Amino acid sequence: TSKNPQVDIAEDNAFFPSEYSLSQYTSPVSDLDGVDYPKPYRGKHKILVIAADERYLPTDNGKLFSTGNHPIETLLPLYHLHAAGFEFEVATISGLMTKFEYWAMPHKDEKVMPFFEQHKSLFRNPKKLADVVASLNADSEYAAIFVPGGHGALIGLPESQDVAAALQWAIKNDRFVISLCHGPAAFLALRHGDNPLNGYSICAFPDAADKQTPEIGYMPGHLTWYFGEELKKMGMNIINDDITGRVHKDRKLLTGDSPFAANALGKLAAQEMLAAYAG
Amino acid sequence: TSKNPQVDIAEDNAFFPSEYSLSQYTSPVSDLDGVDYPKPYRGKHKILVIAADERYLPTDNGKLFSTGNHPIETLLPLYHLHAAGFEFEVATISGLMTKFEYWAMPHKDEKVMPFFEQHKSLFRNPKKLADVVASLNADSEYAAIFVPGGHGALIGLPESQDVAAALQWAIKNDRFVISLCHGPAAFLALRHGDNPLNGYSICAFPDAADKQTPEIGYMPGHLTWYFGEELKKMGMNIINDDITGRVHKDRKLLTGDSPFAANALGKLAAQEMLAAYAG
Ligand SMILES: [Mg+2]
Ligand SMILES: [Mg+2]
């Protein structure tokens, strides 16, 4: 298999991951398992998903990485949560359609694919995050904010006033915040203000791993900044230095380290959320 | 050549124009000519370009047309205007990078390609239109607003409060408004208010032509609405029913009918703008 970045001809100077890197980091079938919720939540609260509206991430040599949200990271936790009785709605900063890394889609997965087909409209036709925020109050029917990973989470979210406002709402109102991989870079949106996530501990994708990708062609160049180091400056603790599929719970902040953590995170989120609403 | 829509694998259920339609509607070299401005403008006023931030246009069967701004329509008028002494700056509604129809890029054009390479950063790193608007006043160093065509102009622009505000500024302050092909759909942003473009006459891409494309595979499905009919309801006059490369001037509203009109529009814009600033 080739280690050369694969041209994405839709865009100028843009590349998908190399054939070789895809063979290491994607599969046609996910690890979804353990969706066993005999007494689901029956209320109306939903997961608010903050997703990526831009597919193209600039790298350090000017080439664009053709990325987006990671479909395993976003669909597996949502599958468990939906099974536990929590439907979801999607928002992007612009209001433009969610942009997925389709090259990581588990295309042969007999459970995840039907789930995607059923719900793809929600991703393709999201709300504008600012509109959701304008309406938020103590009674809002959102049980959690979910920020899926994929390198698309690095675009816009870390700088977004709307994301900051949403996260402040969730914490003030004792709701869940769920994220994994590069998703927690969205927490950087809080850098300008009083920072309600100061002191919190998380799993996240290690910055060190992002420096080993470009050589095998998973990205066409290096990242121009590293979210982990920045989150540490923002007073957050990253508990892992490796990729093991680890998940962590700190109060109502539930996180995972990588795509490998996606199934475990769905389980932890479902368990925690059911308990909180029960009842 | 095949008339089958060509899959754009970056996105789910999305298609580029068919091989056959590309052979009819694109060329490796543009018709750029007549750039002869012996006494250019020397001031600081620029063209403000309102461009497309979304590549994917939903068609009536659920397939996405992989479109964007048309590079001939956007680069040819800008080439003439730059030669006449008017530099440009780019804004999108979201602030995300301009999305071009790269499949229409005149890749062998020895004049246009170097111009694109020189200025591609301006398209890739645009301002957010709302930020530009917040700052607008009587002394703003914008000589014109340019809305290039391509089917990407149909996305967001026709519904945009920021676009409405920009156009109201231009008209109130007796600046130029330049557009061609589907670009004038952006004028639909004025539908909610007092409509300062009521009564104005334009060239535009004929709605009838958009109903003949999908059969030859230029788009993967039909449009769900037609901008010409809507602009007529909004009190504007469309003077052409065909595609001939026609351009029109009504006061300071300068328009063209199609990519064929792009060179002529650059010339008309340059001539009109030089005269207005002279001096
Ligand atoms: Mg190498
Ligand atoms: Mg047919």
User: How far is ligand 1, taken at its centre, from the CA of residue A1, in Å?
Assistant: 15
Interface contact flag, A96 B96, Cβ < 8 Å: yes
User: Taking CA atoms, what residue in B is nearest to A54?
Assistant: B96
CB atoms within 10 A of CB B4: 12
User: How far is ligand 2, taken at its centre, from the CA of residue B60, in Å?
Assistant: 14
Q: Among residues B174, B176, B122, B119, which one has the least CA distance to residue B145?
A: B176
Q: Is B194 in contact with B36 (CB distance < 8 Å)?
A: no
B/e letters for B198-226, b = 16+ CB within 10 Å, e = fewer, are eebebbbbbbeebeebbeebbbbbbbeeb
Q: What is the CA radius of gyration of chain B?
A: 18
Rounded to whole angstroms, the Cα distance separating B157 from B147 reads: 9
Interface contact flag, A94 B97, Cβ < 8 Å: no
Q: Which ligand is nearest to the CA of A5?
A: 1
φ, ψ at A262 (rounded to 5°): -60, -45
User: How far is ligand 1, taken at its centre, from the CA of residue B203, in Å?
Assistant: 51
Q: Is B134 in contact with B127 (CB distance < 8 Å)?
A: no
Q: Is A238 in contact with A205 (CB distance < 8 Å)?
A: no
Residue type, B257: D
The catalytic residues of B are 181
Q: How was this structure determined?
A: X-ray
User: How far is ligand 1, taken at its centre, from the CA of residue A56, in Å?
Assistant: 21
Q: Mapping DSSP to helix (H, G, I), strand (E, B) and coil, where does residue B275 land? A: helix
3-class SS string, A191-208? HHCCCCCCCCEECCCCHH
Burial class (CB in 10 A: 0-12, 13-18, 19+), A223: buried
Q: Which ligand is nearest to the CA of B20?
A: 2
The pair of structure tokens assigned to A204 is 């996240």
Residue B88's H or E segment, with its range, is strand B88-92
CA–centroid distance for A218 within its chain: 19
Adjacent-strand bridge partners of A90? A49
Cis before A279? omega within 30 = yes
Adjacent-strand bridge partners of B15? B7, B65
Which residue carries 């600046």 as its tokens?
B175
CB atoms within 10 A of CB B124: 19
Residue type, A140: S
User: How far is ligand 1, taken at its centre, from the CA of residue A3, in Å?
Assistant: 9
Chains A & B: contacts with CB separation below 8 Å: 51
A73 touching B (Cβ < 8 Å): no
Q: Is B64 in contact with B15 (CB distance < 8 Å)?
A: yes
Residue A225 CB partners (closer than 8 Å, separation 6+): none
Which residue carries 């694919």 as its tokens?
A113
Dihedral, CA of residue B57, residue A142, residue A145 and residue A91, to nearest 10? 10
User: Taking CA atoms, what residue in B is nearest to A12?
Assistant: B102
Entry resolution (Å) = 1.6
Rounded to whole angstroms, the Cα distance separating A179 from A13 reads: 30
Residues of A within the annotated binding site for Zn(2+)? 82, 87, 119
Which residue carries 């999908």 as its tokens?
B214
* Interhelix angle A71-83/A112-124, nearest 10 degrees: 100
Residue B117 CB partners (closer than 8 Å, separation 6+): none
φ, ψ at A5 (rounded to 5°): -45, 140
DSSP conformational letter for B183: G
φ, ψ at B95 (rounded to 5°): 90, -5
The pair of structure tokens assigned to B103 is 């499949």
B7 touching A (Cβ < 8 Å): no
Rounded to whole angstroms, the Cα distance separating A6 from A66 reads: 10
Q: Among residues B75, B84, B77, B76, which one has the least CA distance to residue B43?
A: B84
B162 touching A (Cβ < 8 Å): no
Rounded to whole angstroms, the Cα distance separating A51 from A74 reads: 9
- Smallest CA–CA separation between B11 and chain A, in Å? 7
Residue B156 CB partners (closer than 8 Å, separation 6+): A96, B52, B53, B54, B93
Residue B36 CB partners (closer than 8 Å, separation 6+): none
Q: Is B17 in contact with B217 (CB distance < 8 Å)?
A: yes
Q: Is A204 in contact with A158 (CB distance < 8 Å)?
A: no
CB atoms within 10 A of CB A245: 17
Q: Among residues B217, B207, B29, which one has the least CA distance to residue B107?
A: B29
Q: Mapping DSSP to helix (H, G, I), strand (E, B) and coil, where does residue A269 land? A: helix
Handedness of CA A232, A234, A235, A236 (dihedral sign): negative
Which residue carries 């059969």 as its tokens?
B215
Alpha carbon distances (Å) from B128 to A50, B53, B83, B93, B223:
20, 10, 26, 6, 27
Which residue carries 């890739």 as its tokens?
B124
DSSP A115-155: HHHHHHHHHHSPEEHHHHHHT--TT-SEEEEEE--SGGGGS
A56 vs B contacts (CB less than 8 Å): 97
Q: Mapping DSSP to helix (H, G, I), strand (E, B) and coil, where does residue A54 land? A: coil
Domains of chain B: 1-279 (3.40.50.880)
A63 touching B (Cβ < 8 Å): no
Cis before B279? omega within 30 = yes
B120 touching A (Cβ < 8 Å): yes
Q: Is A112 in contact with A31 (CB distance < 8 Å)?
A: no
User: How far is ligand 2, taken at its centre, from the CA of residue B219, in Å?
Assistant: 11
Q: Among residues B35, B41, B6, which one has the least CA distance to residue B20?
A: B6
Q: What is the CA radius of gyration of chain A?
A: 18
Q: Among residues A98, A204, A106, A205, which one has the least CA distance to residue A152?
A: A98
- Smallest CA–CA separation between A189 and chain B, in Å? 17
A100 vs B contacts (CB less than 8 Å): 12
Burial class (CB in 10 A: 0-12, 13-18, 19+), B49: buried
Burial class (CB in 10 A: 0-12, 13-18, 19+), A240: buried
Rounded to whole angstroms, the Cα distance separating A19 from A38 reads: 41
The pair of structure tokens assigned to A164 is 């900051």
Q: Among residues A81, A74, A78, A54, which one has the least CA distance to residue A65?
A: A54
Q: Is B237 in contact with B221 (CB distance < 8 Å)?
A: no
Contacts with B, A 182-221, CB within 8 Å: none
B225 touching A (Cβ < 8 Å): no
The pair of structure tokens assigned to A129 is 């995050």
Residue B25's H or E segment, with its range, is helix B19-25
Q: Is A229 in contact with A184 (CB distance < 8 Å)?
A: no
Q: Mapping DSSP to helix (H, G, I), strand (E, B) and coil, where does residue B17 land? A: coil
The pair of structure tokens assigned to A247 is 């998940």
Q: Where are the beta strands (DSSP E) in chain A?
A: 6-7, 14-16, 46-50, 56-58, 64-66, 88-92, 127-128, 142-147, 176-180, 201-202, 237-238, 247-250, 253-256
Parallel, antiparallel, or unpaired: how do β-strands A176-180 and B237-238 relate?
Answer: unpaired
The pair of structure tokens assigned to B200 is 């104005």
User: Taking CA atoms, what residue in A is nearest to B94?
Assistant: A94
Rounded to whole angstroms, the Cα distance separating B68 from B14 reads: 13
Interface contact flag, A100 B12, Cβ < 8 Å: yes
B16 touching A (Cβ < 8 Å): yes
